[PDB]
Design an enzyme around this catalytic site. Sequence first.
Site: not given
Lengths: 4, 165
Positions: B55, B60, B63, B102, B113, B122, B126
């Site tokens: 991903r 951004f 991942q 997660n 990531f 975030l 995270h």
Amino acid sequence: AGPF
Amino acid sequence: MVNPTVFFDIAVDGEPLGRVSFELFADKVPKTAENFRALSTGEKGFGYKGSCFHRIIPGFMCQGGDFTRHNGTGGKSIYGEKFEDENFILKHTGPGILSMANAGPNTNGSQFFICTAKTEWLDGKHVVFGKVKEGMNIVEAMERFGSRNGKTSKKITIADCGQLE
């Protein structure tokens, strides 16, 4: 799994 | 003390793209850092070598880390299928930040990531446990193969990985  | 440094040799469809090294903050997030380190050496048998970044969302984050199902639904830590959120001392302050992916509180496995932008929303959700030391341009280059929804156009994988210091 995220992050969103 | 001394924080561990691990590296990732990235490849795109088999063609070597470069190296990325991270500094793991074992001094503040010891368990989380140890997990990532061990998965990078492959000393427990399983690990990151050969897994891909499933991903990538340009602007951004990138991942990866799901070496069991290869699509964000798998992965496991050296402590079991999942461990608790160690703490939220560190924040997502900008590009290079290494954080734990997660599926809700206390569901840390092996997925992580790398931030390619400040992702403050975030914080508290995270666990941040390290940051890119060298090869940040290699990470930006990876964005070239991602999309708005994360699907990647090429097979981006961790050709090799290990510990440096």
